[PDB]
Amino acid sequence: GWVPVTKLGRLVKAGKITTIEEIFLHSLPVKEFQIIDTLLPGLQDEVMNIKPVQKQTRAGQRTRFKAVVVVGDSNGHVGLGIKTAKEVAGAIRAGIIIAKLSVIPIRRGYWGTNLGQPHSLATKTTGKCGSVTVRLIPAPRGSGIVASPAVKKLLQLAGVEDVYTQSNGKTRTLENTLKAAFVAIGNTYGFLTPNLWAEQPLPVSPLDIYSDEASA
Amino acid sequence: GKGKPRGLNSARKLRVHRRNNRWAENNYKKRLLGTAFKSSPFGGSSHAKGIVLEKLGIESKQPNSAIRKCVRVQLIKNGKKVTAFVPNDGCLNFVD
Amino acid sequence: PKKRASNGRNKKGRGHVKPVRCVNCSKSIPKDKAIKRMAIRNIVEAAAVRDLSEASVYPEYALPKTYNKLHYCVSCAIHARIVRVRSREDRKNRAPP
Amino acid sequence: MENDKGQLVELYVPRKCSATNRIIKADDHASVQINVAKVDEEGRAIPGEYVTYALSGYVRSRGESDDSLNRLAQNDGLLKNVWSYSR
Amino acid sequence: MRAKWRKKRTRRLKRKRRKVRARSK
Amino acid sequence: SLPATFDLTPEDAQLLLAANTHLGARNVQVHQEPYVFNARPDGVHVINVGKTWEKLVLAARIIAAIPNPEDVVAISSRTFGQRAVLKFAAHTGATPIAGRFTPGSFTNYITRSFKEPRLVIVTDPRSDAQAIKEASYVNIPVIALTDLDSPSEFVDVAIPCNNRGKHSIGLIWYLLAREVLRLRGALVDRTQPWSIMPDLYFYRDP
Amino acid sequence: TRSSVLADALNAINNAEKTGKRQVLIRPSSKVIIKFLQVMQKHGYIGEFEYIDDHRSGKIVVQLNGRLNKCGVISPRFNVKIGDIEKWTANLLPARQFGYVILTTSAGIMDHEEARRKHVSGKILGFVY
Amino acid sequence: GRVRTKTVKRASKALIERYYPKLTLDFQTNKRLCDEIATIQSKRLRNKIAGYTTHLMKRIQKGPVRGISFKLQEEERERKDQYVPEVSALDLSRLNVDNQTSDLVKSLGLKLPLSVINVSA
Amino acid sequence: AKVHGSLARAGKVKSQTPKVEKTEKPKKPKGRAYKRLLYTRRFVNVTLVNGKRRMNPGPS
RNA sequence: AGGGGAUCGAAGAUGAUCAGAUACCGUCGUAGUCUUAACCAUAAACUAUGCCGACUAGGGAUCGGGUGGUGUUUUUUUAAUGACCCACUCGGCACCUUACGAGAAAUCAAAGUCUUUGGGUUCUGGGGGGAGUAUGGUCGCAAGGCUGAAACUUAAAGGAAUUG
Ligand SMILES: [Mg+2]
Ligand SMILES: [Mg+2]
Ligand SMILES: [Mg+2]
Ligand SMILES: [Mg+2]
Ligand SMILES: [Mg+2]
Ligand SMILES: [Mg+2]
Ligand SMILES: [Mg+2]
Ligand SMILES: [Mg+2]
Ligand SMILES: [Mg+2]
Ligand SMILES: [Mg+2]
Ligand SMILES: [Mg+2]
Ligand SMILES: [Mg+2]
């Protein structure tokens, strides 16, 4: 069982909030990972690499392994979680939890001639993460993911079909190349396009509409 | 202004500036100076023919301890002397 | 990198400060880089004046005071239990102890 | 946004900061949703009905969430001259 | 080593070369 | 707008003046404070008493809009606020936190003092900067009593007042609970003086 | 010294939009300023703007809104041909369904689309999106 | 060393919080309560429990000790909290106001008794 | 360094390796049939899927 | 090249120190330190931040000028002045806080307004060495300055932080 302790986990157990769409609309923090795997049961985990990092001690080195894990369903959502632990097996489970908790929405648009089922990104998006810049230029149809193999999977798992990529700095130390795209692929819902200028009535957050279910 | 001139009529500065800094490259240096023609015992070619003069007992760099069994060769077309390695297990016997 | 912002001294807008010499070893240290410690003292003591007190005409005369200005250097100051050393976070404090 | 024949796409039309008109990302935890009750001719609150205000994390980081609401509320009439346009 | 007295070794070196060179000239 | 009954009555204007609430800070000023008015010589500023009135009702309007009374939280760490915070929270849900704030009371769900407030109240932003901090981390609004030297950073609608004043802090807390109860329905009569004396919400040294 | 009033004007417009403001002061308000902003306000990016007439050169006060993303100048003003409009719009626009490349032609100041609707070309002034 | 440990600090603190109307400031009586009111695995701990109990019970005699709140202790704080004087200290004892507040109220348009006394540099 | 050394022991191990000859084995198919053969052992065969679908793990 | 040559003082003589000590330390000590006339063109000549122009956050202090204020003091209680006080301003040497911004971090109101990449302009760099060497010019009385390679060699020191 889950037996949640959180306002959102209580609703999600109660089934009062049905999709993550309401979570993202009012910017609700997510604390325990049961909220994710029950509202998005279609996420698949993919471990990118396991690299050891060592601390120097009085005598010898103790070893812990970094574990990058990328999650996401192939329609609209991606999560990147990086966690280190003593043993590789334990680090994989913990990095999965952070990856689900870090899930962000994605904006998919068109290169033009919006036939349907958007295939690319709506705008040029850039995410800088340290030295590296990762640029995501939307691509026309049939172009696919023109990207490095490690980045390619992160864009496959987010539902991007056609995209271009341009990099800078050291791409070949991947822990934050995958954080430069995550910023870029997450900055999709930050750019204000002319098709979003309209003003909305500010929907009331579910915590206030459904406050009658509070635990105490 | 980022350094370099941006004037619409400064192509002369940009082209000449690029010429002067192209010399810091190594391939552009060797190509235009023609060093491989003037040096590098071949004539810019990939192969050369010569006569074996003797065998050598060159010892290995760090970290490695071994004898490499090379040969001194004097080239035909220009007469220059080079040292060449004889790669395989025991192929120094065929190059006496 | 730069260990500190002023980074040796108070020279900001001068270039030259016409240096002085250390009181211990005579090192030609810059005057604004110096470690000036004004020394103020009584001419004799605050404890042995009792013995000198009964042996003086002009009762409670002045007990005059001795003044000095000492210019130490970095090597001399650090070596003799002076401003010697602090933590990286506490080097910003410009108030005297 | 929309495809060729209706069929609304681009889920999660996000909100806008009431002051800067920028949008609020999902990970913008420094943003605030403000519900202010409206009271009519009785002095007693009417639960469930609000005058809603949303502020982005940018203004709150800069310490003008208070100032923005002073002008925001006054324009709706639920304040008085506390905010003056001329400076 | 330090750059002052590798620079200084080279100047005593350059002094030596011009001295022996001028003998041929 | 307002029914003109929420307007500041003269029988409450002297209380604000009897508590020296209009007394501001020194010549030191924060530009984020447009509430200053008509400074005295020797470097004394004064807050327009008109402003702090509807700034006060606005805070109660937000408080009354929160459905559950206990989702309101008030934070006190300063000496002059421990008795005020608990007295205000005695007459409302408005669950109080006083003394040590044990940082991580908003995040870190496994902490003993985990709280998920719909809106918090802090007496002094500088002494309650930590309480203001996580409210900017887990999406929580903040109501603060602010003088002209206050750090309005990460603070929603604020009350211009004199946090230095001994009775100014208590009275503003008092008028806070008075106006919250009236809107909720506890005080049907607006003209009724709320017999509970404002001297209740004060600080005593012994 | 000052070389482009448009660069100084548009930089002031961006720095006010970066900081969240609704207004900015523009000095010294050349003719190509109004023409640049007149194009900008027709597309809704800026809106109301006001010309303060001092007897020296003029001033402009602009009322802003959060629609604008970036508004800059490409210097030098290259000659762009009717076939080279595509390269400019691909390099300096976020996408090809929105955004405008402002470029001066013999027929006044216009965007990259109005140039295509009129099939005229000229020199490039800047961009707003 | 004679500095008591956590297992002596915490067990003792748990007693006054719950046995305030109970075992007194005399050690030899306290230790004959602990041996039956609490299951302590070792005598040496029980002897140190009734030791730090007496030390804390001797503190509570003269004033209260901060960090200890037994529910009988704070009635002084849920009786002093309602302590209110009938004098109504917020009322008028005769209000003084500087010339700044003189025209401040006039700007606000309120009728208040203003015994104005000027305070200036 | 040194350019002299033991040149008398060149080819020490190659001339020292015991001579084991190639065993006679049936010919493998060439061209398309090899792709037919390789496809069978990899995709429609589950012979070596021990933990990771190894191709030529050592005998164990 | 003169004048000067009181101090200190590259060379050196001694006394130490030391296994050695032609070093550090102690005693002396010439060229110089000083100056006039003429050369030298270097410095970690450092803010290791080219110059010009624009905009973008708060705070106090100070220097020069100025503005206003029944403000204070001294003169002739009393004017003007001058010196202080308060508020503001223009220019300047700086400092304090924070990061929405930048950076590789250290840090930075400039090292910001840069993959959302264009204000103008000058100079310099392209792995570490060989090497600021060789060579040819050129300036200088000289010391050397300016300009300035190649052959050949080879995966091997830090700007920065972290743990020991
Ligand atoms: Mg690259
Ligand atoms: Mg030009
Ligand atoms: Mg200098
Ligand atoms: Mg130099
Ligand atoms: Mg330099
Ligand atoms: Mg500048
Ligand atoms: Mg100044
Ligand atoms: Mg100055
Ligand atoms: Mg290179
Ligand atoms: Mg090199
Ligand atoms: Mg190697
Ligand atoms: Mg280092």
Numbering used by the authors:
A (entry chain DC): 34 to 249
B (entry chain DX): 2 to 97
C (entry chain Da): 2 to 98
D (entry chain DV): 1 to 87
E (entry chain Em): 1 to 25
F (entry chain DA): 2 to 207
G (entry chain DW): 2 to 130
H (entry chain DR): 2 to 95, 100 to 126
What text appears in the publication on this structure?
A central event is therefore the splitting of collided ribosomes by the ribosome quality control trigger complex, RQT, by an unknown mechanism.
While transient ribosome stalls may fulfill biological functions, e.g., for co-translational protein folding or targeting, persistent stalls usually indicate a stress situation that requires a response. Such persistent stalling events result in the collision of trailing ribosomes with the stalled ribosome, thereby creating composite interfaces which are then recognized by cells as a proxy for translational stress. We found RQT exclusively on the lead but not on the trailing ribosome. Along the trajectory of the swiveling motion, RACK1/Asc1 of the lead ribosome would clash with RACK1/Asc1 of the trailing ribosome.
